[PDB]
Every structure is written in structure tokens, then in C-alpha cells.
Amino acid sequence: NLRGVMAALLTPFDQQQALDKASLRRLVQFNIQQGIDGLYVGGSTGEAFVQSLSEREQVLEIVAEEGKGKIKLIAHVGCVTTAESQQLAASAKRYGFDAVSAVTPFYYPFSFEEHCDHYRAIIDSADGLPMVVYNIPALSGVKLTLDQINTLVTLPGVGALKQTSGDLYQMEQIRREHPDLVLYNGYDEIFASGLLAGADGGIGSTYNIMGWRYQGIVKALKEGDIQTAQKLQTECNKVIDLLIKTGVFRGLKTVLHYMDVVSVPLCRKPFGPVDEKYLPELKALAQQLMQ
Amino acid sequence: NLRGVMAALLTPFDQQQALDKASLRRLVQFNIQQGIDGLYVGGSTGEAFVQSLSEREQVLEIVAEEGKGKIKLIAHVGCVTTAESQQLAASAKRYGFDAVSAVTPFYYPFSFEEHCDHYRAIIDSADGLPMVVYNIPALSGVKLTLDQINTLVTLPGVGALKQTSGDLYQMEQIRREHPDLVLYNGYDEIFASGLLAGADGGIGSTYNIMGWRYQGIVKALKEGDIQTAQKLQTECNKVIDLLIKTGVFRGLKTVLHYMDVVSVPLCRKPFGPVDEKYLPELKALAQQLMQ
Amino acid sequence: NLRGVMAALLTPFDQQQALDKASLRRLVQFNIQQGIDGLYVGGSTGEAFVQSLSEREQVLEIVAEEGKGKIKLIAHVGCVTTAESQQLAASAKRYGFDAVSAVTPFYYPFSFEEHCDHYRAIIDSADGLPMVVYNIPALSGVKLTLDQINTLVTLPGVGALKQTSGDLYQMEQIRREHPDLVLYNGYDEIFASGLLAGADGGIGSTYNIMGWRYQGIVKALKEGDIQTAQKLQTECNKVIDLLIKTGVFRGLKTVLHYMDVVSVPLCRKPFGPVDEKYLPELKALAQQLMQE
Amino acid sequence: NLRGVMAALLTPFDQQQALDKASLRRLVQFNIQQGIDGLYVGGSTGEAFVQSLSEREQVLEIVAEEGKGKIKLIAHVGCVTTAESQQLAASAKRYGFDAVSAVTPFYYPFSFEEHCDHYRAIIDSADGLPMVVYNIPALSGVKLTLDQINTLVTLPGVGALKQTSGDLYQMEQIRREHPDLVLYNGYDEIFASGLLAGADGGIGSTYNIMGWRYQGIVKALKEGDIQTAQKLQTECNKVIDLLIKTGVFRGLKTVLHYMDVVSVPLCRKPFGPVDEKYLPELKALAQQLMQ
DSSP, X not given: OOOSEEEEOOOOBOTTSSBOHHHHHHHXXXXXXXXXXXXXXXXXXXXXXXXXXXXXHHHHHHHHHHHTTXXXXXXXXXXXXXXXXXXXXXXXXXXXXXXXEEEOOOSSOOOHXXXXXXXXXXXXXXXXXXXXXXXXXXXXXXXXXXXXXXXXXHSTTEEEXXXXXXXXXXXXHHHHHOTTOEEEEOOGGGHHHHHXXXXXXXXXXXXXXXXXXXXXXXXXXXXXXXXXXXXXXXXXXXHHHHHHHXXXXXXXXXHHHHTTSOXXXXXXXXXXXXXXXXXXXXXXXXXXXXX | OOOSEEEEOOOOBOTTSSBOHHHHHHHHHHHHHTTOSXXXXXXXXXXXXXXXXXXXXXXXXXXXHHHBTTBEEEEEOOOSSHHHHHHHHHHHHHHTOSEEEEEOOOSSOOOHHHHHHHHHHHHHHTTTOOEEXXXXXXXXXXXXXXXXXXXXXXXXXXXXXXXXXXXXXXHHHHHHHOTTSEEEEOOGGGHHHHHHHTOOEEEETTHHHHHHHHHHHHHHHHTTOHHXXXXXXXXXXXXXXXXXXXXXXXXXXXXXXXXXXXXXXXOOTTSOOOOGGGXXXXXXXXXXXXX | OOOSEEEEOOOOBOTTSSBOHHHHHHHHHHHHHTTOSEEEXXXXXXXXXXXXHHHHHHHHHHHHHHTTTTSEEEEEOOOSSHHHHHHHHHHHHHHTOSEEEEEOOOSSOOOHHHHHHHHHHHHHHHTTOOEEEEEOHHHHOOOOOHHHXXXXXXXXXXXXXXXXXXXXXXXXHHHHHOTTOEEEEOOGGGHHHXXXXXXXXXXXXXXXXXXXXXXXXXXXXXXXXXXHHHHHHHHHHHXXXXXXXXXXXXXXXXXXXXXXXXXXXXXXXXSOOOOGGGHHHHHHHHHHHHHO | OOXXXXXXXXXXXXXXXXXXXXXXXXXXXXXXXXXXXXXXXXSGGGTGGGSOHHHHHHHHHXXXXXXXXXXXXXXXXXXXXXXXXXXXHHHHHHHTXXXXXXXXXXXXXXXHHXXXXXXXXXHXXXXXXXXXXXXXXXXXXXXXXXXXXXXXHTSTTEEEEEEOOOOHHHHHHHHHHOTTOEEEXXXXXXXXXXXXXXXXXXXXXXXXXXXXXXXXXXXXXXHTOHHHHHHHHHHHHHHHHHHHHHOHHHHHHHHHHTTTSOSOOOOOTTSOOOOGGXXXXXXXXXXXXXX
């Protein structure tokens, strides 16, 4: 039931780098409009790690007002701190989110046992909302084994795994081991490949501007049409190429600004703005996607 | 015409740890009858790096005698030394191989130009034979960029790329850049996903014992039956889970042995033998693969 | 005036995980009486990334009170966010600290320019307090180059470099490039070698329980007594070996708790408690350090 | 008694890239006159991995012939193949080298037991020659654990360890574990620091052009003159800075060439030439060094 193509919501800031509630609302609605199955809020893409708990809760509350009941809402609640995560877990519950999620805590190296108790404590605080384990070795620096992953994924309370890893051998072993597990493909660039390996949906930042393509790839693969599946994927991939040159969060916000969704396409410092030289390609991209 | 499913051939040894030429011939034929498209000989799978050039030249000659004309023959000629490689390249030509191949020279760190000059030399000595750049970062320790991969791939005389990387975002990037390039999926564990990403064939050590499944996966994806393609990949992956436990080269040789192909399922030390506990499952798999 | 042997201050918490101010003050004074050159507060050792800005502000404020120009005071003000770092940098000035510090922002990959601007803005908000650029690749996952380090270290406002790296070739080269740079060695396990290589002092978590050994290695080398320099370092290493087994922060708090300095030997979750099995060794260690 | 500053021997090649015996002998004696405690022949610095068994043996005999009895002689006998290594170990005995040495077999991933048995076999063939374990993770791609290094170092036959690692905490840990172990500091850029951490000697390539400095640092440290000890290490690093910039093996041979020691300062391909922009720098270096 949590399966599908969920977008990792971006958080629009204003000239003062404060939250832009109006753009947030425009963004939520814009995603709904584009036929997304749900939203993963306050994740890395939402720049959670560069905002406070209150700022973080404020976003959860607003998207819940906008989207609750219309699509699935998963609140990324993870912090390095379990206590901070627990507080966020409770708010998500209070706001009516469908599930809660958390990255494997970072910076300080924690044992695998400490990782499990973290999830256990957060799940406790979720008070019912299922947990989506969030695995992104590349950013967390947390390199869990398949076994550790199997343990986490079986922790009572866990309803999904957000696999932000390009190891498609592992993607399938996870599927082979947990046939019923809601498996989200974390890297947009290999979405079609991830689904073929075992993912049954996905969460990602590029879904904010072209979510329909991912839905497309999903149908095609269902309708045994690898031609449109591959075609759709290379089209997502050309966009990802550019965003990787420009900065994905900022580049996605910039395109969004061009679709009239976001007022100021800035990210919080230390992120810098997009290089002016990249604006013609982003503008152009916004235009084509607008059609 | 180099596109297809090519077994990365194993080299049988006797109790004295010396080529079991009689089993080599038996392995060559076995592969042919299982409908393989060609053989990548003298690679990592063939324990080439624990061999002498003369040993490698001998294996080259026996398989050419065994299959020149029956299937495509690609000779892995790579050595850390350019001159040794050129020697091996020159015999491949003289023995009648269809193409030549070489790992990026390892152990010592080399600049990219050195890498390109290395391939140029080998390509020259191959005397007309198309070259197959061999990319396996996990074993070579060489971490080439995409631009570098494009440069190598476009070097005159080069006719294909053997991609032993599970980075399927890079697989498609390469493909998007080179629609005519013969791209071999190097990781058996992700074959279906690798093809979907842009690969048009594969070279793998597990093909030796169940190459038919990989061809089947090719038919399925070709026929829009991703459902049986997945099924084929998981079956291939259950095998891979086991071989990775028992040790791959030796595991395969043991299976082939129970299949009456290899007399002595040994690998040359440092490799040790399979743990006896594994024998029943390998024996079981052998009988089972006889499907 | 920032050169020296300075302890990476730990932050004591109570049974309910709240700050234990009395033990903070108690730990500040203990370090002072231990004859350390100053304190590095709010850094990795201080469990800053498991606290909130106002929590870190409180700690800075309490120790500034305690360390009233009694010793050198460095405030690790770094966060991923430049703005949060600026706020902390401004409080540090406000509390009267001697220097300001910050790790290279983590989690999200940033460009070198993004990093240089980050340090400037903070240097900007410190309003006069020098900046000790903080380099710890192992934790930040940020891999700066010598030239990137050079740029940072020459950046106006920057007055020191906290080298938490085992690469002593790079340590040598940085000293070579900057003969007067306050270079602090970050890995206590190699303190003697980092010094020989060019580090002119150090900042470490284990200084909390044996800051004198580190001060000793310094004298030992100053007087060419490399023989005792070695003995001190292996004595430090025998300790670090145990601390790594148990978990460094918690192990330290545990020793310090057995020395009646820290009331509760806990670290905030997700850090769990120390395995009972190690208590016999930690009690003994606390015994002998006190014996010394 | 293998304790000491041992120079890692370069193998001079001719214009045709063939062993330049004239220069080998010339270098053996040059090193001797430098007051070096011995020579580590046939190692990484000796381009062993780009040579053949026969060529490696040849160089072994010529050097035994040139310095056997005069200085300590450790022959690097290591290859990926245990059998090849054994053969070279057997020859070292024959030529009368003092010790044997082998890098952890690389390229293919081997188990620690496989690693152990390999050293055992080679130990068996060195016929009485104590084995020197060569740890160089950077190039080998092998990251043994301390307990693992401890096992290796205590193997019956192992007499020393060449630690090519900049982990000076592990250095002191090895010295603490084995107070009577012959521990060679492998990275010349940290010589002084390695010795202070526990190494009682060192095997380095740069020793070939200024072995006196390392012997110099040793005395200063032994005398308690860290100030000059340092002043010495900084000098070696100014050099090392350059060589890295120019390519170490090729840079060294060039400097020795300007020191009328080596005829053709060529490394074997895939390595390339020293760029011309450096010749003046290297020129200037060789002059200063000779005075």
C-alpha cells in the first residue's frame, strides 16, 4: 500500500532564506497535479540537514494540510539524535503522515546494534506509522551489509526500505529475501534497471519536475514495453546529467521557478547559486517539460 | 558482429596444477553446445594472472584449434606490461582470434595517456584485430572517468567495451554516447538490468555452466517478457550467491566437474580448494543444471 | 598564542540525557588543574552534532564563565549550515572565547568555493576571533587537498589548522608551506610523530584524562629525550587501545566518572552505554591515572 | 640483524628496455658506497611486476654477485602465483640472498588463510631464508587487520616486516606487539616519524639517490637531535615532492643518470618518459646531491 512513485519534496526558501510557504504549497500541489503517488518530506532533498526541528516540523504540517488524504505522505524524521528523531516521529503522527522514515544516523560511527535501537526508538515514537529504513551509503557513510539490511528491514514496525544504492545485485537479493517488502529505488538514474532488479517503486528528487516519466517507465515495464521504458530512462538521464552539472537541488528549484512553481530557486548556505552559464539549458528544459 | 553472450572461459588444470588440455577442449566444446556466442579466453576467469605468457599462448592455441570458425573468439591479452601484452596480441592474431582484449594495466599507477598509449601498442601488435577495452575497477584499482572511457572507446582499432562495473547509470551514459559500441555487461549478477541500461551482450564466468539462461534473458527482454527475464536473473543469482560462498572459479570448476567436463576442479594456489561442506550443493546444482 | 596542548572538551549529560552543568564546570576545572593549555568546546568530542544550537550555546557560555581567561578557549561553532555556524560564532565572541572553529560542512557534498565562503561568513560573524580550520576526513568525508588546505589556511581570519589526519607527509608539507602556522595534531595515537613532522601542538579527546602525558611528550622532544617521548606515547596508546574497544567518548566519561569528575558516564543516543565487561579495565585505568 | 636502512633497488634498462647490466652493477656499488645497510632487490621499485621470472632471477644473480657478503641482501620474490614466487625463493637461496620477501598476492581477492598458506609455501622454498612480509595496501589493494598482520609476522619463518603504510598508530601497535620484530618503515616521506613510532629501519626507493640522509636521521634520532632529524626529513621531502611530480621511478633513474650511474633513465612501458620541463630540476637535484 505504500508502494509507488513518491517524490522527495524540495523545500522552497525566500530571499531571506526562510521557508517560502506559498511556494511550498505550490510545489506540493504541482506534484499532486503531475500524478505522483505520494511525497517523501523533509529528506535530504528537502534540505533537512540544513534546517531546524521546528523548521522541519513546519514543513510537515504544511504539506499535510495540502496533501493529507490526497496522496501518501512519508515524513523523513531522521536526525543523528534519536531524541530529535523521536520528536519528529510524534509530530508526523500528529499531522497525519502515513509513515515515518529516517536515515541511518551519521557523522559518528555507531555499531549495528546502536543503529537497530535507533530505529526501534523512533518506531516507538511513530506510534503506528510504518517505518521506511533510509539507506544512502554515499551520504551517510554508513555501509551496512545485506545481513544488517535484512535485520533492519525485519524489525517489527518497518514497512519499507528506501534503497539509495546502485548495487542492483543487492537490490535483487533484498527482493529475493523479502518478497513482500516495499522497495524504493533511490537513484533516479537507474530507475528502470532498479525496478527490473526488484524495486517496486521509487522516491527521488527529479520526480518533482518530471514525475510522470517515472510513472511512464513503470507502466511500460508492466506492459512489457522495454522500448519506451529505456527511452523514458535516457530522457530522465539527460536531465540528470545537467542537474548533476548545475547542482540537483538548486537546478530542480531553478527549473521549478521557470514553471512558475518556486519564487526564489535558492538553497541554504553553504550551497551556492547556480552558475549563470547554466541558465539557458535550465530555462530551455523547463520549457520543454512544460508540454 | 561481436555482440552476443560470450563465456569468460575457465582454464582446467591437472593434479600437478598444469593445464588439463583434455578438459580445456571439453570445456570449449561444452560451451559451444550450450549455444554460447563466443569465448573470451585468457581473462581473469581463466586465471591468466597466475599464468605465464607461454601458458596463456598455449591456452589460446588449443581453443582456437578447438573453436576457430565455430564461434567468436576474443583473446584477453592484457598484462601489466605493454610488451608482454603485444606478444600475446601477436599470437592471438597468428592463431586466428576474432578480436583482442586487455585489462587496464594494474598494480603500478599509470596516467591516462599511459593507459591510451598502452592500448595503442597492443592494438598495433594485434595486426587488424578489433580491440576490446576491459574495464574492471574493483580488481584493477583503476577508476576511469566517463570522458576517459569515451576516449579509450573511441581510440582507432577499438571495437568494444567489456564493462565489469555495476554502475548502470554509467552503462547507459556510455550507450547514449556510443549507440554503435558493442557493450558487454561484465557482472553476471545484474545481466538483465545491465542490458536494460544499454548493454547488448555480456561476458561472464558463470556462463560456462548456465549460459543458456543468459541467452534466455536476452530473448525475453527482446520479446518484451520482462517477467521471465527477472525469473531467469534470480535463478542465475541464487547460483551466484552459492559460488560467491564456495569461491567462484573453483565453484564453477567443481560444477563442470560433476557435469563430466573438468577432471580436477582445482585453481592454482594461492587459491585453495572448495570447502567440502559445499560439495553437496555444488553436486546438487550440477545435476540440477543438467535441465 | 593558540599554539599548545588543548583538550577536546566532552559534554556531561544526566541520566535523562540533559546537560549536567555541574559536571561541565567540574570537568572544566579538572582540565584546568591538569595544566592543559586551553579547551576546544563544542567539537566532535563534545557531541555537538547530537545537540541543538541553544544547547551548544549554553555549554560555551558555562565554560567561558569557568575558564575566565584562566586558559585558552576555542569554540567549535561548526554546523552543516553556514547561518547556524554564524549564530554560534557570534555567541562565542559574545561569551569571550579566544578563537572560533568549524569542521568542513558535511553530508551534502560542497565545492571548495562553497567551503571557502563558509569559513569567511563564519570568520565574518566571529567579529575578530581567529578561525581554526578543522580538518577530519575520517568523519566529515571531505577530502581536501594540500592546495585546498593552503588556500583555507591563508584565508584572512584563519589562524590555525586542526589536523585530524594520520597523513604525516601532508603534515610535514603544511608546516613546510607554513612555518608559523599553529598546527594542531588531531589523532592522539600519533601525537609524538605528528609533532616530529611539524605539528606544533594538539587537540584531543584523551587529554581530558591524561593531558599531562601529552604535555610530557612535548617536553621530552623539546629536550631531545625521544626515549621518554616514546614511553609516554605507548602509555597513551595502551589507553587509546582500550578506549577504542569501549567507545572513546563513553570510555572517557567512564574513567572521569570513576574519578568523581563526571556524575553520569553517558553519551546521548544513538550512542549506547559502555559494555559491562569493560568496567573492570576502566576502573583500574581510573585508579592508576589517579595514582599518577 | 636484517635491521637497517635498505635501499629498494631500481632495475636499469637499456634503450631497447632490456636489463642494463652495466648500470645495475654500477648502481649496486653506488648504493654500497652510500653506506646503505643492504638492498631490497626485485621489489615494486625494481619494476618486478613488469618483468618475468627469468629476468627477475637474472637481476637477482647479478646483484648477489655484486654485493653478496658486502651488504645485506633481501630478494623480493613475490608474485600473484605462489608457485612463481616459490621458484624465485628457491633461486634466492641459490644465489645466497640473506632474506626473502613477498607482497601479499594481489589482483584476485584471496582469503587471509590463502594469504597465510602462500607465505608458508614461499617460506618452504626459501630454504632457510627468513621471510620479510611486504605490506603495501595502497598498491596491493589488501588491507589486512592488525590481528592479521600479527598472524603473518609470527608465522614460522617470518623474520621481519616492510610496513608500507602511513598509519603510524598501527606502526606503534606492531612494535608494541612484537618488541623484537624487524620493522621497516616503507614511506620515505615519513621516515623520521615512522622510526619514532617503532620502525627500527626502512626500505625505500629514494634511498638510491640520497641514502645517507636516512642513515643521517637515524643517527640524529639515536642521538636525540630531533631538530636535525627533522631538518633532514624536510630535505628528503622537498626531493620526494619533485619525484612524485616527475614520476618517482623515472625521476630517480634520471637523477642517477645525471650522476653518471644509469645510462638510460627509462622505465618500462606502460610507464612513460619524464617530461622535459623537469630535466633541469632533476639536473639541478643530482648536482646538489653530489656534494
